[PDB]
Amino acid sequence: IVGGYTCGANTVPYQVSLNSGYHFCGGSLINSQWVVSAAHCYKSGIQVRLGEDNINVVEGNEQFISASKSIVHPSYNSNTLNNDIMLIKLKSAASLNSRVASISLPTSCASAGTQCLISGWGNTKSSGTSYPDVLKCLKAPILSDSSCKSAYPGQITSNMFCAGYLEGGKDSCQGDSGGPVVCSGKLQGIVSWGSGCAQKNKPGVYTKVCNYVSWIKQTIASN
Template structure:
């Protein structure tokens, strides 16, 4: 069973806010991930996202909702820190071939209603080229997803975790034919360190480049030989450029 890493919408899971960690991670140095975006459905936190230029956020297609609110410059979601910028998604552009069963092409662009102002706390990140991410690369994920699994405990502050990129062969050994050419796996073989529900759409950064979008994983996060699965950003550079340049009405809808 494939399980998207979006936060529970209707409160079926217990949400206990604490300073515990993303599974196996730790609190990020405040504002050390200035491209990190918090995506809300009305006033409910749902997904992560990534600011790739002043007007566009990249996230997962399974985070496709109406009334998307965008929060930039966040660290602690429960208090006002004076670093935040708030706007909403004026256009929502999921990949046209996104498959909600297999999570293939799990990628989406959001056009901001008002451009972000670049500050020390809000910055863009460059995209990963095809040769920038190799097996064994040490990369960093971040998000406000649950720090426990299967019970859900959502942190107030942004969590960071260093994980390793696995080979395509290893990834298919873990998940079989569920892995497409547009996906890759990252984590640790022994488990205990993973992205989880609520981290969907957030960044996997290798060096200083955005190489992955948090997508899906096993329903119980952090298991041995069950790493997280990520959308491979380098496969979508042309698609991203085309959407930003044209705002193709066959792909994008206004809200």
């Protein structure tokens, strides 16, 4: 997260860190046994880390639970990043509490102008590299489909939306991949892509979760 703020320990209780020896992606806890992330976060050997603030220090509220299975969206295209969504099942159910909590799926798609919260442990610099140990947060509006398409001609599908600031300086970044965009207490987006980070006229692009609610629910019901 570039140009954001320190969230505060366990203030984003649905935020998870995916760890394969090291943090490599965020995700969102959607019930006691399932996490939503980006398809481009797929790899084997995933441990889900819940209740994290400082990902380098055991602070006392963590739950570390290995994934039993990952399900990448059947229509995920790694070239275009269309359908950039995946589900990860925990080997055992997380213990839910004030600091480890699921986030609701949307009942309807959020509109341009809606203020959302984007969070992650990704790079905090737009040029160069600095990775924070603690969770970073950014409040950002959903942008119009037209401004999104204008920023990224030929690249925005019906399964993507832009959020952030055309002026630049505030954005998600590498390492935030797979993490949440939450608007009015609903998971509306997943950190997916962008040209660099926090660049003028290159806002963040997010997987449009509201298009996947049926797939998510049906997949969970049978797996």
